[PDB]
A paper describes a structure:
TRAP has proved a useful building block for construction of artificial nanostructures. The wild‐type protein forms a ring‐shaped assembly comprising 11 identical monomers. We have shown that cysteine‐modified variants of the trp RNA binding attenuation protein, assemble into cage‐like structures with Au(I) or Hg(II), called TRAP‐cage, disassembly of which can be induced by thiol‐ or phosphine‐containing compounds. Here, we report variants of TRAP which can assemble into TRAP‐cages mediated by Co(II) or Zn(II).
Based on the crystal structure of wild‐type TRAP, a histidine residue was introduced at position 33 of the TRAPK35C variant, yielding TRAPS33H/K35C, where the histidine and cysteine residues are located at i and i+2 positions of the β‐sheet motif around the rim of the ring‐shaped structure. The cysteine residue at position 35 of TRAPS33H/K35C was further changed to histidine, resulting in another variant, TRAPS33H/K35H, possessing a pair of imidazole ligands. When the TRAPS33H/K35H protein was mixed with Co(II) or Zn(II), it showed the formation of pseudospherical cages with a diameter of ≈22 nm, similar to TRAP Au(I) 24‐cage. We constructured a number of cages named as follows: Cages made with Zn(II) (TRAPK35C‐Zn(II)‐cages); TRAPS33H/K35H with either Co(II) or Zn(II) (TRAPS33H/K35H‐Co(II) or ‐Zn(II)‐cages); TRAPS33H/K35C with Zn(II) (TRAPS33H/K35C‐Zn(II)‐cages). To verify our designs, we solved the structures of TRAPS33H/K35H‐Zn(II)‐cage, TRAPS33H/K35H‐Co(II)‐cage, and TRAPK35C‐Zn(II)‐cages using cryoEM single particle reconstruction (see Methods for sample preparation and Figures S2–S4 for analysis pipelines). The resulting structures showed that these cages are mainly composed of 24 TRAP rings, and the overall shape and bonding network between adjacent rings is retained when compared to the TRAPAu(I) 24‐cage. They form two chiral cages, and each ring forms two metal‐mediated bridges with each neighbor. In the structure of TRAPS33H/K35H‐Co(II)‐cage, every bridge has in its center one ion in close proximity to the histidine residues introduced in positions 33 and 35 as expected. However, a closer analysis revealed that the coordination geometry is unlikely to be a perfect tetrahedron but rather a distorted one or an octahedron formed by 4 histidine ligands from the protein and 2 bonds with other ligands such as water molecules (which are not visible due to limited resolution). TRAP‐cages that possess only histidine ligands, TRAPS33H/K35H‐Co(II) cages, and TRAPS33H/K35H‐Zn(II) cages, almost completely disassembled in the presence of 35 µM EDTA (1 equivalent to TRAP monomer). TRAPS33H/K35H‐Co(II) and Zn(II)‐cages were more sensitive to pH, disassembling completely at pHs below 4–6 and above 8–10.
Author numbering:
A (entry chain E), B (entry chain F), C (entry chain G), D (entry chain H), E (entry chain D), F (entry chain 0B), ...: 3 to 72
The structure:
Amino acid sequence: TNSDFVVIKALEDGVNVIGLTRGADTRFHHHEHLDKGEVLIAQFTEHTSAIKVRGKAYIQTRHGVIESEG
Amino acid sequence: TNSDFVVIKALEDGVNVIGLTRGADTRFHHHEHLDKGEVLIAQFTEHTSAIKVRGKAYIQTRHGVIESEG
Amino acid sequence: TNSDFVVIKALEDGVNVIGLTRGADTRFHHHEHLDKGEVLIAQFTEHTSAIKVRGKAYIQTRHGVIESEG
Amino acid sequence: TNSDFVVIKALEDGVNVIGLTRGADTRFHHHEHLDKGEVLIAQFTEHTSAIKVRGKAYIQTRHGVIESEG
Amino acid sequence: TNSDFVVIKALEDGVNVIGLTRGADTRFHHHEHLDKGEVLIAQFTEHTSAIKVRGKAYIQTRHGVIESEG
Amino acid sequence: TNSDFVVIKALEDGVNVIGLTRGADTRFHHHEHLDKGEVLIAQFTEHTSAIKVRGKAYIQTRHGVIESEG
Amino acid sequence: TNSDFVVIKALEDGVNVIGLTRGADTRFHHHEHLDKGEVLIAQFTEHTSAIKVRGKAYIQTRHGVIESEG
Amino acid sequence: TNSDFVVIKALEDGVNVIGLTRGADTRFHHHEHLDKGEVLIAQFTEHTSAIKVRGKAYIQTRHGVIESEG
Amino acid sequence: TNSDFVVIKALEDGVNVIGLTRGADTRFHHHEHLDKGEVLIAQFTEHTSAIKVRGKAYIQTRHGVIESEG
Amino acid sequence: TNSDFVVIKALEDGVNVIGLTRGADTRFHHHEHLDKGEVLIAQFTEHTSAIKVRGKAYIQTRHGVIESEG
Amino acid sequence: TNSDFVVIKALEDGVNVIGLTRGADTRFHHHEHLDKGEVLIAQFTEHTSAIKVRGKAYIQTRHGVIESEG
Amino acid sequence: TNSDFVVIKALEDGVNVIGLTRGADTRFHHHEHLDKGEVLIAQFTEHTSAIKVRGKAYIQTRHGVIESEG
Amino acid sequence: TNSDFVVIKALEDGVNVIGLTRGADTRFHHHEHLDKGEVLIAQFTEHTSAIKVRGKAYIQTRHGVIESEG
Amino acid sequence: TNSDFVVIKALEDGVNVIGLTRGADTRFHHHEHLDKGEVLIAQFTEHTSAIKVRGKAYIQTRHGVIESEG
Amino acid sequence: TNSDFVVIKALEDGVNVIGLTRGADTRFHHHEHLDKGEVLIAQFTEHTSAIKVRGKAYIQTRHGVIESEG
Amino acid sequence: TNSDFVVIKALEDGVNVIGLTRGADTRFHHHEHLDKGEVLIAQFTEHTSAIKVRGKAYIQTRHGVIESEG
Amino acid sequence: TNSDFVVIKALEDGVNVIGLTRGADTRFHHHEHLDKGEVLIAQFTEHTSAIKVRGKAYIQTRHGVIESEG
Amino acid sequence: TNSDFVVIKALEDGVNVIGLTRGADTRFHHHEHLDKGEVLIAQFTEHTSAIKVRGKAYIQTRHGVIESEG
Amino acid sequence: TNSDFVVIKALEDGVNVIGLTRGADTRFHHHEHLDKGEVLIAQFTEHTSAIKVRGKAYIQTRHGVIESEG
Amino acid sequence: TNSDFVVIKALEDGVNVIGLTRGADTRFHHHEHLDKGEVLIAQFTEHTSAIKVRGKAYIQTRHGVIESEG
Ligand SMILES: [Co+2]
Ligand SMILES: [Co+2]
Ligand SMILES: [Co+2]
Ligand SMILES: [Co+2]
Ligand SMILES: [Co+2]
Ligand SMILES: [Co+2]
Ligand SMILES: [Co+2]
Ligand SMILES: [Co+2]
Ligand SMILES: [Co+2]
């Protein structure tokens, strides 16, 4: 349910990180803006079950490294 | 149950991700649209048992990497 | 009982994925149709114990990769 | 008691998979027919403690791969 | 929820480490200043769910090493 | 709510007819397979409010005749 | 719910007319066999919602005339 | 339900008209014999849901005229 | 259930009009004899559900005109 | 039961119009005499279910015009 | 029972219009005298079930136009 | 009893319209005077069951147009 | 008693529309003045049973169009 | 009292649409202003029994099309 | 009250559709924006008694077709 | 509230059909995506009062045929 | 809420002043017509929170003078 | 609500000053006539919220001087 | 909290004015559309705390004059 | 606490306006995005005590005009 995290590094100005709500109905719960060079370490919690990343960014997860260009 | 997640990156405009309900009767409970470049990190929960992906996409799971061509 | 999943990619149109009921009695409980190129990430739940795959498909499990040619 | 499974692929027409009942007395529980090319993913449960395979088949388990020639 | 930590080393003067709150609402909860050379070992707790790092820094996590340039 | 029906004739193999559930939440209810040449007469009821047709088919309604090319 | 009927004339031996059950669940509830030349005038009732016709037959409804070639 | 009727004229000796019961179990509940030239005007009721006609006969319904050759 | 009528004109001496009983069991309820040139206008009621006409006669119904030669 | 009527015009002296009773038993209830030229507009009621016309007369009903020659 | 009417125009002096009674027994309930050129619009009601017209008159009903020469 | 009306236009001075009462007894209840060129739209109501028109007038009813030459 | 309306267009200055009361006793209850060109759509209601039009006007009803010259 | 509507199109600037009260006393209840080109679809209700249109306008009703020139 | 709808197609960008409330008071309740090419099918309900259309649009109703130019 | 339906055929990929909520508040309640060639028959219910169509589509209603070009 | 006013002078015929309601919901509450040369002094009150001015007009407020060119 | 006044000087005979009511519903509550040369000092009060001036007049308020030409 | 206002003049067609909600959470509470030349005088109230203006407009506040070019 | 406001105009794309909470703890409470040209008029309230502006913007307060360059 918990105890797993992602590492997101912003490779450009204005990168959006959106957390979707946990439960029967899914809606936006929070978002964060990151500037060029920022690093965020985010954890899965009792109110967040999905994470969307908009903008150019570099992401590290247990399954490896990925790059978003949104 | 929980504590396991998939990583989906959209390689083209209009990628659809559909979540299926947990219980005896199975029916669509939510869908998400992804544009070219966006990344979604999704978790299995008490209201999601299966995940369906339509469109050209790149998927990372604990068992490896796969690509959907739909 | 839970917390393990399979990955199924349909290599041809009309692939059938059938789930069998958990309990003293056994019969069909649901099935899903997959079009060419689609990917399903399915789990094991309290109402499903066995999974049958009909049609040409590519399967990833904890024990490796297999190909069904039904 | 749970959380373990086997993967059986039928290499010929008419492959039989038999489940044996869990409890003080051991007795047949159900049988399944597989045609050439199909795949079954079967889990150990609280109503099934042993699994028997008749016919030419290819089996993947945690301990490796085996081939039945019955 | 717990039992995981990050290691941050400040590679320049004036590095800021910000902790975010665990709960229904997300709010800034605390920040720490690091001078050129200091090392902070920070854990995930019941009152913390995310950590942001502003400034040039070297970060070690379970998923590897990253560098923030901001 | 009742006393209205549609006539569907399958012009090709594998035509799918899907019923959508009546109520606050809209969800799949049942699907039917039609082979080349068969005819189905379906009625609107208190458990079905919408009907979806996939595949090459010929449809007669109170408003006239239509042809689906799916 | 009622008060509407269809006319089915069998143009060949062994024409099958199947009635599906009205309710939350759907399954076969009755079927009738028609010999060559026979005519059935069937209604819609509280236990029947849909009608399926297998075999070569001539059908008259409020929307016109159709021919099944199953 | 009621308030709808059919007109059958026998064009040969030995025409049989069979009525089917209204309810869950469908069952023949009565039959009538018609000789060459006789006319029967029959109505749908709370104990009749379907009507079957064997023999050479001329039938008039709200949807038009049909002829049975049985 | 009611409120519909037939018009019968006797084209020869001794024309018999028979009314069958309404209910689970069907038996003769009444009959009338008509002489040449006479006209009867008959209504469907709570005790009559079917009508037989024996002898040469001219009949008008909502569906059109028919001639009996019984 | 009601809400329908016939129009009878007497084309010769001495025309008889007979009403039959509505109920379990059928019995003559009333008769009327019409002279050459008179017009009677008669309704169907709770105490009448059939109408018989003896003598030369011209009759108009919802189904058209008829002539009694008796 | 109600809600229908006839239109009578008197073509000669002294035209009689007689209304018969509704119930088990039939008797004259009222009558009206019309002079040449007058027009009466008369409705079927809870106390009138049949209408007789004596005298030369022109009558319009839902079934058409008739002329009384009594 | 309601929901039906007539249209009367006076083609000459002094046209009288008389309304008759609804019930067991029938007596004149009201009259109206119309001057040349004037139009009255009158309805059948709970207290009116018949209408007389004296004088030269033009009348429109559901059954057509008539002219009173009084 | 309701659900039926008339359309009145005034073709000259000072056109009068008078409403008559619904009940045992009949009297004027409202006058309406229309100027040259105005259009009124008026409904039959629980307090109005007849409508009287004075002046030059054009009237549309279910039975057709009429001209008032009062 | 409901279930009937009018369609008004304004052919000039400043067109007034007035609704009159439903009941014993009749007074103004509301008005609407329309500009050159606007279309209003208005319904009869529990508080409106008449509608008056002032100004140049094009009106469609169940009885046909009219034009106001106020 | 219910059970009647209009079809509005936007022929240009920025078409406004306004619904007016049902009750003693009349107020603007909701509006909808339509862009060029969009079709809206709108029903009459318990909270809507009038519909106002601003902008160039094509409207279909039971009375025919109209065009707004606002 | 019920007993009416529309027929939508999708002439291009990704056609959106949106349903609006019934009540004092109006908001998006559900939507459906249609592929090129697919046909949806949709009914008006007690949770839906309006329908929007986005994309190139062909629509059949009681008032005729329309084409959306959104 | 009070103690503040605006001065509006009409520079042309037909100037409309509209007052909006104070509360959670916002609907038009009253409007006023001004002819050329006329002057209105209006106050903000417990029931008014906004004022719209349509038409060519000259407005004085505490912040200065403005001109509406509607 | 108080403590603010306007000064009105009449520049011609017959100048009208109209006071509007303070409350949910707005109506005239008082008219004042001024002759050529007279001066009125009027206060905003608990029963007056707006003031309308008709005629040629000179007005002084806190925002300056205005001239009415009505 | 109250007793202050802004003056907005629309310099172009389609200017949007949005009012945000007063309280712990901020959301769109109402909006208004302005056509070219219209003027709105808007007050701060117990349910509005912030105002956004989209579109070309001219704004007067206690701090001076500003022009929005959105 | 209240009764004072700031005026912010966005001079470039992507301007952020952040509100801080009133109470014992200071935390971010809300943010707003402004596009190039938009104007926001924001008040001080019971839930807000400070306002930060990120991005190129033009600000008007009681103390004068300021320009943010960030
Ligand atoms: Co944001
Ligand atoms: Co969607
Ligand atoms: Co299936
Ligand atoms: Co077997
Ligand atoms: Co027999
Ligand atoms: Co006999
Ligand atoms: Co007499
Ligand atoms: Co007005
Ligand atoms: Co809007």
